[PDB]
Amino acid sequence: LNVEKINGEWFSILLASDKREKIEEHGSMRVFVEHIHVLENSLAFKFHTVIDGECSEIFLVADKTEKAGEYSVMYDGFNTFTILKTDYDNYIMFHLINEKDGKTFQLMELYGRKADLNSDIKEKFVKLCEEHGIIKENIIDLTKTNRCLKAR
Numbered sequence: 001l002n003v004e005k006i007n008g009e010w011f012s013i014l015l016a017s018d019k020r021e022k023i024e025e026h027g028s029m030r031v032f033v034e035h036i037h038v039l040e041n042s043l044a045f046k047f048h049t050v051i052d053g054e055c056s057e058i059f060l061v062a063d064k065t066e067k068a069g070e071y072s073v074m075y076d077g078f079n080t081f082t083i084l085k086t087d088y089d090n091y092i093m094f095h096l097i098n099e100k101d102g103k104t105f106q107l108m109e110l111y112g113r114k115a116d117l118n119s120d121i122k123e124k125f126v127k128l129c130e131e132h133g134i135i136k137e138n139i140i141d142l143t144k145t146n147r148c149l150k151a152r
């Protein structure tokens with residue numbers, strides 16, 4: 001991975017978790033990326049989220065950990081994540097582990113450089129989720145939800 005090439009604007013496409021409530025409509029992880037800015041030791045993210053039906057912004061900075069390719073950020077507990085796959089110019093797939101109260105769950109996300117991705121890429125992401133124990137029923141196609149596109 002050449003992490004500088006993930007810089008810029010992205011859209012949240014598919015959102016998946018082995019703890020489904022976290023990504024349901026009022027869940028803390030139901031967030032919609034707008035950009036990723038690559039810094040020397042970190043990644044700076046801007047997201048939107050819906051709070052009581054209203055779009056709202058979330059800004060996070062994730063720092064490199066001592067494990068190559070891994071980043072950490074505090075948000076509803078302690079999160080670590082990695083980049084599983086990307087072609088830089090169309091898609092990126094993230095894998096995240098949240099810890100809170102000594103309990104963990106996984107989050108996987110598919111972002112696109114455009115507001116949608118084709119079925120081939122989506123199905124490949126679904127299979128990768130299943131490879132992590134994230135079942136098909138726990139993958140949400142955010143293009144059929146409020147992603148706060150109007151707020152971008």
Ligand SMILES: CC[C@@H](C)C1=NCCS1
Nearest residue numbers: 031045075081094096109
């Ligand atoms: C808490 C933010 C979370 C949704 C992230 N996903 C990919 C990088 S940060």
Ligand SMILES: [Cl-]
Nearest residue numbers: 146147148149
């Ligand atoms: Cl929308």
